[PDB]
Amino acid sequence: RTPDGYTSDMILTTVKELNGKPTLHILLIKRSLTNAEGKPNMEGGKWAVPGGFVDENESAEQAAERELEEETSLTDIPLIPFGVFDKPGRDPRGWIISRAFYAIVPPEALEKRAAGDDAAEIGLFPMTEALELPLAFDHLDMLKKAFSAITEEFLLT
Amino acid sequence: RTPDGYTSDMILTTVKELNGKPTLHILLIKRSLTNAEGKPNMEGGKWAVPGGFVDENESAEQAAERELEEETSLTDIPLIPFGVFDKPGRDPRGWIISRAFYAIVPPEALEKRAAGDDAAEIGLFPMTEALELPLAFDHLDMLKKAFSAITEEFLLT
């Protein structure tokens, strides 16, 4: 018995004004209602952080650097590791181990994707609102641990 | 293509006097010359940190807590995560992802194992000497990143 997958998942954040106050926002992507065959999707309709499967010939970091660019065209962004999500059962599709990173990027690239041609599918949420969404997998746990770590970094300054 | 394994690897350290100076030591375990069949062992004869494979029904943390007890009978020891070692090729046996932890324990349990009935096989090394050993897999990289993190924690006090 070996693992079914390794993923690189990204808490992608920015700071922007909500009601004239600087507020931490997160980019999230709603899972399709259907899979490729047109039947009901696992975790269908639930919001997920951006990310993807890591390839045999890369590190989770390399996969996160790539997935950052595919989703936003950002390129010179350090990704901060903040955990591993490996709790048995986290992903119903099998034994999948997630390496989780956060990044703090300028708001404009995230607004572009939330407003582009996938708009119904992508949102830029204040983090307190994101925490109340219907979230895929253990992603609520991911967001709570990221929020906490990011906040504690912001507090130290 | 999925991963071949997930491991929980432990940098197990203590502080004790070497030439009347308090020095960081590490417990390491020499890999057998042979595998179970009696033929040459992968990474045979090379020193490795304690650790083991994580089971489908546990977290890497649970596996580290267990492996701490099997190797030393310590039980109330917080394990500090310090990285993931996922670099392609790190383990010749396949695609194996390591979740790495450190712990700082009292010297006596580590001295017991280094002096017990596996004595030729187990050593408690000053960390600077451990860094020069013939080390299995990427464990040199693991020890250098642990040493660095542990030192920077000790410096903050």
CB contact under 8 A, A5 and B3: yes
Residue A30 phi, psi (nearest 5)? -75, 130
The enclosing domain of A151 has a CATH number of 3.90.79.10
How far apart CA A27 and CA A50 sit, in angstroms, is 8
**How far is residue B57 CA from its own chain's centroid?**
22
Of B54, B60, B97, the CB nearest to A6: B97
What 3-state class would DSSP assign to B125? strand
B1, B59, B84 member nearest A60 (Cβ) = B84
Residue identified by tokens 């194996």 is: B96
Domain of A4?
Answer: 1-157
Stated in angstroms to one decimal place, the resolution of this structure is 2.2
Phi–psi pair at B151, nearest 5 degrees: -50, -50
DSSP one-letter string for B23-60 = EEEEEEEEPPSB-TTSSBPTTTT-EE-SEEEPPTTS-H
Which of 74-93 (B) contact A at CB < 8 A? 81, 83-84, 86-88
Q: Report the candidate in A138, A143, A118, A139 with the shortest Cα–Cα distance to residue A128.
A: A143
DSSP single-letter state for residue A40: B
Number of domains in chain A: 1
Are B3 and A1 inside 8 Å of each other by CB? no
Residue A96 to residue B97: CA distance in whole angstroms: 12
